[PDB]
Amino acid sequence: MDVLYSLSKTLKDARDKIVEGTLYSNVSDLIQQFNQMIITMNGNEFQTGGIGNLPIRNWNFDFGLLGTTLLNLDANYVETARNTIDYFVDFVDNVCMDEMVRESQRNGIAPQSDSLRKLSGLKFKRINFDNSSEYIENWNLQNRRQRTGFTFHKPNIFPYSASFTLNRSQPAHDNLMGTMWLNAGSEIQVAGFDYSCAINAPANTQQFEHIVQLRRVLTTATITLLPDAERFSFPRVINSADGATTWYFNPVILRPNNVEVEFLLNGQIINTYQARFGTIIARNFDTIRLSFQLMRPPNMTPAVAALFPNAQPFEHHATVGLTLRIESAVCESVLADASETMLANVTSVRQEYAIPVGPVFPPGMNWTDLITNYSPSREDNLQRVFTVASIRSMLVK
Amino acid sequence: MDVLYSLSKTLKDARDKIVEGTLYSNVSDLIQQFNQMIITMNGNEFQTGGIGNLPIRNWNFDFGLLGTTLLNLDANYVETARNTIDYFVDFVDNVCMDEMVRESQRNGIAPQSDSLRKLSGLKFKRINFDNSSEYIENWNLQNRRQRTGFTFHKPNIFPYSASFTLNRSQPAHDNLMGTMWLNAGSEIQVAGFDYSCAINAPANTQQFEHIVQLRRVLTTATITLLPDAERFSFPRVINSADGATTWYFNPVILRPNNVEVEFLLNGQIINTYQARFGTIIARNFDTIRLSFQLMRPPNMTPAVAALFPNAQPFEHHATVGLTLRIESAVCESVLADASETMLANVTSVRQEYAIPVGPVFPPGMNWTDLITNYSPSREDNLQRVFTVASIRSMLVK
Amino acid sequence: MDVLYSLSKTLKDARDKIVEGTLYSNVSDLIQQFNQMIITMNGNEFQTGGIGNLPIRNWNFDFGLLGTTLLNLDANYVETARNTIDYFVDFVDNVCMDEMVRESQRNGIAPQSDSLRKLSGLKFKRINFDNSSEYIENWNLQNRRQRTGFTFHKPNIFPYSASFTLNRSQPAHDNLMGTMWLNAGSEIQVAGFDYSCAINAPANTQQFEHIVQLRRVLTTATITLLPDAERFSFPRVINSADGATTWYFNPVILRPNNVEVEFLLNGQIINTYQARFGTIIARNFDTIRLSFQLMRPPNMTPAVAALFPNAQPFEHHATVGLTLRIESAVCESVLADASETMLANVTSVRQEYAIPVGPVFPPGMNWTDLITNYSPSREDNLQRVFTVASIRSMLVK
Amino acid sequence: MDVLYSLSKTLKDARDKIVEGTLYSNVSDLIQQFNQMIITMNGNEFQTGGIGNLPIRNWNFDFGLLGTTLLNLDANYVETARNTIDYFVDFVDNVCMDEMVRESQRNGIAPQSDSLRKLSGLKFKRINFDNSSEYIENWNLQNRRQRTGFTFHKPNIFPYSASFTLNRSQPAHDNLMGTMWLNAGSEIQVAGFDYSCAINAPANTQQFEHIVQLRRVLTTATITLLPDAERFSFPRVINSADGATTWYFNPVILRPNNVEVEFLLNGQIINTYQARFGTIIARNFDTIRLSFQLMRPPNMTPAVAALFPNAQPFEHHATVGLTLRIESAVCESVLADASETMLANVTSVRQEYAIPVGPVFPPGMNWTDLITNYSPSREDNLQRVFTVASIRSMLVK
Amino acid sequence: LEELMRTGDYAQITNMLLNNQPVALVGALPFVTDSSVISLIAKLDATVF
Ligand SMILES: [Zn+2]
Ligand SMILES: [Zn+2]
């Protein structure tokens, strides 16, 4: 594997540092490394493809090394080189793609393809170098075992979930109490509603709570917490829990009272914030718990008093809510986020070549399904597959 | 042009790798490259500016080389160097800026300024070096004509468009049916409304559709699709299509029924998703088509039934919607996005120096106008101008 | 300080370029630099910790060196090296952390710890190297007293502020006029409401205005401006200004009329946009002023006319709004944003080790409190502390 | 590709400059070039055809050079040469044709056939020369990146479109107002009709407008603009918009009033002409807008007055029109025109050999369909295919 | 060959020959005739190199 990496920074730090103009010496340490490769190669033959609509092209080698004609390169030098790189480019592509589809339950964390199984061979190791590409940097550290780590903007940790829970309901659905939410990606919006506006509640306060369990721990998270759930602040006609009928939600919003956000790790409170809106830090957690209350206003102007009668019908439904967004965080496991193209690259190559559903990944590499049942096998395969996508993007975008 | 690039990574990999300490040998390959430059320059004369409120400045060259002698680097070595770099810094700035304003219809691609037209000269080519800067990497590949590519977070592909289409209307605007939307940047929100709640519609279902045609193809897009259009979930007083009067929109939201998103390329469906909310991948498309329906609830509690009478007046307006956001994507053409400062740099330099409107770009480099009529000339000029902005940001931010 | 930096790119460009295989001459310029260090060290004693729940591990030096033979690298070479790096890793961590807590009213911009105060020493200077890490690049340019600069996607310039101002009110709160807003992070949403729908207003138009003063100037900002404030488009029960009672807000939204956004710098208009929604550029500003109006619709269909009577009670409250988001910008001062983990790293290390509140930073490194009173001392300490966090993240995430 | 070109001017400037007699020295510079070829060839086998009714002829090489001895060519010299050319002729034909059918959605701009994919090979480029054939001249400049350009006559920019738009109509179709037109090739004819002769129109003038959007920009266009649309000056029975019935058009023609032609580029007026009939120049445009009016004659002789009553029935229908013809223009993209045989050559070869419909071109290479959806892929394929047709026509017509 | 001698070897050839790989040499050269049936048998032509 590490092999693979080199093959690229080789070409990039190549198709980049090799131009009609630079002095030789600015690439002496480079040229060398390069040649070394050519040698090891030439001779051994390779097969790629052999699946779905994936072409099976056979690659063979036969190339001369590299001159040196001192004092900056002459155009002629470039072209006779680019022509030799463009075989490695069009090659690697066909290589990445081939091992970017095969999956395996038992040992699906290692090489699968007849192309790569031959690369991990020993006679090739003679290449590896400049491992500064964030992903490889992390691949290695994982093979020895140690505190890995990745960086994500608006991470995709929450499988899509949009639902409600009626804590008090009746057939007519004219006096409900409960919560409704949307957990998706890096965001959570949750609203607590009480049609009675806590008229008969102890201390005229109705308590609400929303708990979200992450499938992986997030560390060093920068989070925006704001009062109100705009998504649940408008009139709705919703299906009943049993799907037999529809109820009416006509919210009127009040400020959430006694807001408390807890970021827990294995049941322990790691961070807790009381009514703090704006930017907060959650340094290590696998669970978020949002507790908030609806408190019936003790003093009401006529217009307000009119919305909350002592007896039904309850026509304006008191609602309090919260919005929480994880702007950035670090995770020890690969995840999809709002900036990286890895998931999209893997999903796209599989879709383009009509790759059949395999035994590991959900149909279509569906993110929600994947993160919902993020098994060790799916994670090892995902990491292998994401690392390859990142190697590929150094040359082909 | 490629020339220009070097001039920088030269300085950065310079003003960075050269300080009170370090051993010579870690820069040997560097020092050299540097000097080479100085030579080529000295003697040659330059001119920049002379357009709008832009200062005209002349520069000459006549500088010493570098002590390829010493083992370590003594403070004294630095200062006698920084003083020579600070002329190139304050120079390049005045150079970028000069060619970051001129536009041209015919060859809007090539160089313009009396400063650069002299750089593409042959005698200067003796300088290229380390092109791993994402942008140059792509500039070159475009000359050789090949599959380029860039990386964008919340890209800016949709020209601002906020409007509606009344499929059924009448003077009183008391029983409308149609759609309203907001396409802007990387986001689309669209709502379909039917004041009659499909009371007389076949199967009590009203079909809606929203089509958005991108001006450039996006590939490897990671997209968030969510039900509901919050932007169109509240009461509004809107101007009529003819501007002669105003209508009232009083929405009540129902779940969009039979949601189908199609990402098409040249009329062909490349990706299709049926009612899948959360994160989805669209691998290659130039058009998005969102189809969704409003289905009159077959079973209604009294509170719901009361909103939807068999006869007018229709006071609660049934509305279904969708929200789609392109988190990241790759485009073969440069675009503005939510992270890169290119557009802002170009726009800012032009504004600061009171640069007159030219023949290519819309007044103020207006993004909506630019992307709406993204002609080949505007794109070639934009790419040239964005690449220069990126060269400048390596030294001056 | 600059010292510190090297110690890392040393290890990264190390733990990365040294793997079973690679040709020596790709690291010759590297090996050297490395050794040089070892020497300078061996013969020095260090101490870290001694504060809150922070260990006090002690360290000594006395190490071997490295061959300069071998064309290629043999596994055995690596291990005998990794074992020597893992002492520097586990070291630096304990070093960063130690100077990542101590704050000083006085020279909070300089070194503090018994660990670092010894590093700035002269005999250590013989180690600097490759300063291309965006943050150090900026540290230097600042020490030399020069023009700095940074990059941020969705910066965090607005301290959380959610409030309202009633320009016309009365005890019953049945005919109010004023504005309500939410300034947080990189976003502003503001709504202007007039319960009377400008029935008695000159030209039937009510003017609104919202001014936001940034604590630091932002340059090269790419901004999204959209009509409407969704956050203030739904029914609310709000506490009165004096907290003695609650009022009812029942908005109906109209398009904001005569929208004018001004980005000012020291009282001067630098950029001004009239009713331009979508993407706009603000090149240099310390203040944003949003002016917009509610104009009573001159022509109304019956349904609309019914919402706006000539006499109270006013039951539908005319509301106009704007939403402004700073997607990206450059600031000469460090700030938290939606992508960088600096604030989270600093905050997390302090929380994990139970570091006591100091004299400079607000309890918990609270962002709102910090940016609200962003004194020179807090900024110098923040920059020092952010730069260290960035040095640490090159090795430990 | 460029390869291909030579192969021809080789033969033409050959089968032409070699006739019984000529003094050698008119060809010395020629003979040479020739031989050079033969060499490079001999020994390499070739394959063509393999689809529809396209024979699979195989080819081989092994030919003697050409005695450069003689001073005056003797008949015997010719024949021993013509016999060797007639293998290259009958060859190239079978070569062009083979790559003049294959198409590719992705890189549909590059070579496809097993015949050509081998030509772009490097060992072959030892041939290129005399690229003065208008088409190759342009192929290169495009591969190099610059303002291309072709010359035409009665170009074919308008997809066939013949229709009408009724701005005022009623079931009986006895008092219509609207426009009817024919856009086809390089010509536009448009008529505006008002059955009422503007009897109740403001200022007794009815405004008309016709906008035509070109799929490609035309530059340096010489255009004939004439008043009247003869095509719409005679009695017609036309199908109604819904196809349910037929209406009667009985025109009487009046001079178009306030004629204004605008040639716009990206929404901007580049050229504007007010009532100027005859020859006008439109230097750069992607849109043509024709505005004209029908003004009721303020003074009418009895015979005229009788045609235009104050009340229906309206039996003579006032009509005004314009005719615009683009005689010549330059386009950066290949197009069909009234003089070049390219489209006809490509279409003819495909038809003769029963070539199956492919993924790029519309069935039958239909021009209207092609220009209506002139995608980048269709244009790249069209240019490749047109350039090959032009290479072929140098030898085979 | 010319391109080698006139430029020293890097052993590219040395390696290919060593892991005994199929390779060719272009240009003029000596040449030695031999009639020893036996010779062929002792794969002499695989020596010299
Ligand atoms: Zn974002
Ligand atoms: Zn003609």
Automatic annotation (TrEMBL), chain E:
Instruction: Please outline how this chain is modified post-translation.
Output: Sumoylated with SUMO1 and SUMO2. Sumoylation of viral proteins seems to have a positive role on viral replication.
As for subcellular location, the record says:
Virion
Biological role: Inner capsid protein that self-assembles to form an icosahedral capsid with a T=2 symmetry, which consists of 120 copies of VP2, with channels at each of its five-fold vertices. This capsid constitutes the innermost concentric layer of the viral mature particle. It encapsidates the polymerase VP1, the capping enzyme VP3 and the genomic dsRNA, thereby defining the core.
Fill in the domain comment.
Answer: The N-terminus binds RNA. It is necessary for encapsidation of VP1 and VP3. The N-termini of 10 VP2 molecules form a cylindrical hub underneath each 5-fold axis of the inner capsid.
Subunit notes for this chain?
A: Homodecamer; each decamer is made up of two conformers of VP2, called VP2A and VP2B. Interacts with a VP1-VP3 complex. Interacts with the intermediate capsid protein VP6. Interacts with NSP5. Interacts (via N-terminus) with NSP2.
Similarity-based family = Belongs to the rotavirus VP2 family.
Protein's UniProt name = Inner capsid protein VP2
Q: Please report the organism this UniProt entry assigns to the protein.
A: Bovine rotavirus A
